[PDB]
Design a protein around this nucleic acid. Structure first.
Ligand SMILES: [Mg+2]
Length: 666
DNA sequence: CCTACTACCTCG
DNA sequence: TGAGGTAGTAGGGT
């Protein structure tokens, strides 16, 4: 079932010979810099030279003639002040089919765009973003509307425009004028004289004229020495703290600070965004000399709608609260009220009783008559509950302090009980909140509430997540789904490539328990965010235990946007691009702006791409703790993310007191 | 490319 | 602590 789509990219004219044959320029820096310092330097030199020049190798490339560039000059990096001399080395014709050359050409194109935007009338320009309309204004502020553009070169030697509409919140005032309008104090603020930012702590009346500043002159005298005040006598003392270490305070002036405004002190329907993409594309196209922008169309396919099921077919995990679960053994749940009231609110008890009745499962509801503020007796009531088949506890409480939330969760978890919080006051009308809480509680108690009916290539699908930003050197989490759902952690700084295999191996082991075999083929999912080689060991071991596998990277960005040529916009959209890579629009709702397609890469294995798309998109529905909206990412990745978030939150790098079939972290 | 924060709007 | 995605904002001396 195929269709056709638009991407938010636009084809423009092919590059002329002069652009294919740009000026090449050698660079010398006195003093000669190191090895891990030369590149940032060269970029700085390229900005310094002026014109449409970029870095190429250890030199520069330009579309502007040497005669309008700044050939000799002075510069300052990390203390070392350099002098640079440029030497024209002729014109080097680059080929777009060559990736390195094309990368240089694309840099030159981005430069071209930036320069053409800078010399443009009537618009408000910032970087590669252009803003054309005032969408809102207020006493001292503004919300501009426009688009973030991009411009690169295809391997075919042609320009490519990318357009995505956006708003920009701007402040037209200094901090003092902002405060003089009676507006509240912003959390973040900026130097009016440079780009450094701070967090605003408070105000001070320790007058600016008489405020000693580390050996010598005063606040005012200091700032006036650097010619920042430029005549004007600045405002009152603003106490500001550099974002890094908020412990140490630093004096400043409200007349030299500019509020950094957030929406705290603006989304578009897909159809509107499509429109404005078109409009802005046309305008930029006219204002450049790039020609007529022609939107790139792509072949797409409509994946089949997943068939969720409980004790009867279902559309969302909430209807299982009426219809019954997929797998429900006997359960005992327990209530703990941190407020003053007693017993279950009747609607929760009723919903639980119905759901279990319609599943042929027994349900026991215990009520903990103890308070978290009794250490010993509370732990005794806890163990008494646990020793009577209690599998999870629901917590009715006022909004908790964060630290107390963490403490309570930790305490209950260590005695062996996963926990769900639901805030009071709580009306029966607040349907989605307590239904969501109930689904969460059920999933934490070990229940399989929904499952996918269908034939899937990989019997087991596991997704990973790292504790560190860029390696698994700190661990450490994995989640899997058949189909039953499990999680895995490492066991208390390690060789990054070993952690991954540890997680995968245990996962396979749990599968060996509950299923009695090893899986035929498996689906390995990673959110990229890591080098591939951290998986090499796992890939080889997988190929050594005789297990078939696929490795797919799943990224949230870099796919741009996808619109339909005609008709309505739906999910289950699979857009093939080429070599092992594809877009996948997993999730969308009308009121929910415009969807952002996921970008997926097929790194290992050799299963048909469409099949992988099918299963991944289907796993989009298997997350059981939402219940009204499906996650954008496949359940294993979503769950893995939540798991490391919760491990970091609770600090449970050592937790062997809870079963791995229970999803305590939702 | 990635995270975090708050705001918004609904509830496959 | 209900949760989802899409928005905006930020981040990868004085
Ligand atoms: Mg939760």
């Amino acid at each position: 079932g195929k269709t056709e789509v638009f991407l938010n990219r636009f084809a423009l004219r092919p590059l002329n010979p002069e652009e294919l044959r740009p000026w090449r320029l050698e660079v010398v820096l006195d003093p000669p810099p190191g090895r891990e310092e030369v590149y940032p330097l060269l970029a700085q030199v390229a900005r310094r030279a002026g014109g449409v020049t970029v870095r190429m190798g250890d030199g520069l490339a330009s579309w502007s003639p040497p005669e309008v560039l700044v050939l000799e000059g002075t510069l300052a990096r990390m203390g070392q002040t350099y002098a640079y001399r440029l030497y024209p080395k002729g014109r080097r014709p680059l080929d777009p089919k060559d990736p390195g050359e094309r990368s240089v050409l694309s840099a030159l194109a981005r430069r071209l765009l930036q320069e053409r935007l800078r010399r443009l009338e009537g618009v408000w320009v910032e970087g590669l973003a252009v803003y054309r309309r005032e969408h809102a204004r207020g006493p001292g502020w503004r919300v501009l509307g426009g688009a973030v553009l991009d411009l690169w070169v295809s391997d075919s030697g042609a320009f490519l425009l990318e357009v995505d509409p956006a708003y920009r919140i701007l402040c037209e005032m200094s901090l003092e004028a902002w405060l003089a309008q009676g507006h509240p104090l912003p959390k973040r603020v900026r130097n009016a004289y440079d780009r450094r930012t701070w967090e605003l702590l408070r105000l001070g009346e320790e007058d600016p004229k008489e405020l000693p500043l580390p050996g010598g002159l005063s606040l005012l005298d200091y700032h006036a020495s650097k010619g920042r005040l430029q005549g004007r006598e600045g405002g009152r003392v603003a106490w500001v703290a550099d974002p890094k270490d908020p412990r140490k305070p630093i004096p400043h002036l409200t007349g030299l600070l500019v509020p950094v405004l957030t929406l705290e002190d603006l989304s578009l329907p897909w159809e509107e965004r499509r429109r404005r993409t078109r409009e802005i594309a046309s305008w930029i196209g006219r204002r450049l000399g790039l020609g007529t922008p022609e939107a790139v169309r792509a072949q797409a396919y409509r994946l089949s709608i997943p068939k969720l099921m409980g004790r009867r077919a279902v559309s969302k995990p909430a209807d299982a609260l009426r219809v019954g679960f997929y797998r429900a053994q006997e359960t005992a749940l327990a209530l703990l009220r941190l407020d003053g009231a007693q017993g279950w609110p009747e609607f929760l008890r009723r919903a639980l009783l119905r759901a279990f009745g319609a599943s042929g499962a027994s349900l026991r509801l215990h009520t903990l008559h103890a308070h978290p503020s009794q250490g010993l007796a509370f732990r005794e009531a806890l163990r008494k509950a646990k020793e009577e088949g209690v599998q999870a506890v629901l917590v009715l409480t006022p909004p908790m302090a964060w630290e107390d939330r963490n403490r309570l969760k930790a305490l209950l978890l260590r005695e062996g009980l996963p926990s769900q919080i639901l805030n009071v006051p709580l009306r029966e009308e607040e349907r989605h909140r307590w239904e969501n809480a109930l689904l969460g509680l059920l999933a934490k108690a070990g229940l399989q509430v929904v499952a996918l009916s269908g034939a899937y290539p990989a019997e087991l699908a596991v997704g990973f997540d790292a504790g560190g930003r860029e390696s698994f050197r700190f661990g450490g989490a994995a989640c899997a789904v058949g189909g039953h759902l499990l999680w895995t952690l490492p066991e208390a700084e390690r060789i990054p490539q070993e952690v991954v295999w540890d997680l995968l191996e245990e996962t396979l082991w749990a599968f060996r328990r509950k299923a009695g075999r090893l899986p035929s083929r498996v689906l390995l999912l990673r959110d990229g965010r890591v080098p591939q080689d951290e998986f090499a060991l796992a890939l080889e071991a997988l190929a050594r235990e005789g297990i078939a596998y696929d490795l797919v990277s799943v990224r949230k960005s870099g796919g741009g946007r996808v619109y339909p040529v005609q008709g309505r916009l739906a999910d289950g959209l699979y857009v093939p691009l080429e070599d092992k890579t594809f877009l996948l629009l997993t999730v969308h709702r009308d009121f929910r702006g415009t969807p952002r397609p996921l970008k997926l890469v097929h790194e290992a294995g050799d299963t048909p791409l469409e099949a992988l798309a099918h299963q991944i998109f289907h796993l989009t529905r298997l997350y059981p703790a939402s219940g009204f909206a499906f996650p954008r990412l496949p359940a294993p990745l979503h769950l893995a993310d939540r798991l490391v978030k919760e491990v970091g939150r609770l600090g449970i790098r050592h937790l062997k007191e809870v079963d791995r079939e229970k999803l305590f972290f939702v």
